[PDB]
């Protein structure tokens, strides 16, 4: 059976999905400060209850 691959070469370049509704944000997506991506509608922190985790890491060299 002469085969090679079944599907399509579509690697995850810059795939982004709203952590609130997973609307696949991108065109106008907003990456919250906490470190997440949301939609223009869920871009606000209060909307997705921003849980910015601070002083929660004791490794690697510091910086500013
Ligand atoms: Zn959303
Ligand atoms: Zn946030």
Swiss-Prot record:
Zn(2+) 2 binds at residues 18, 21, 39, 42. A zinc finger (AN1-type) spans 12-58. Zn(2+) 3 binds at residues 32, 34, 48, 50. It comes from the Eukaryota. May be involved in environmental stress response. This is Zinc finger A20 and AN1 domain-containing stress-associated protein 4. It comes from Arabidopsis thaliana.
């Amino acid at each position: 059976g002469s085969s090679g691959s079944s599907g399509q070469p579509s690697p995850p370049q810059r795939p982004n999905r709203c952590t609130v509704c997973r609307k696949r944000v991108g065109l106008t997506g907003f990456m919250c400060r906490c470190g997440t991506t949301f939609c223009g509608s869920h871009r606000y922190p209060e909307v997705h209850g921003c849980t910015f985790d601070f002083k929660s890491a004791g490794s690697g060299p510091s910086s500013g």
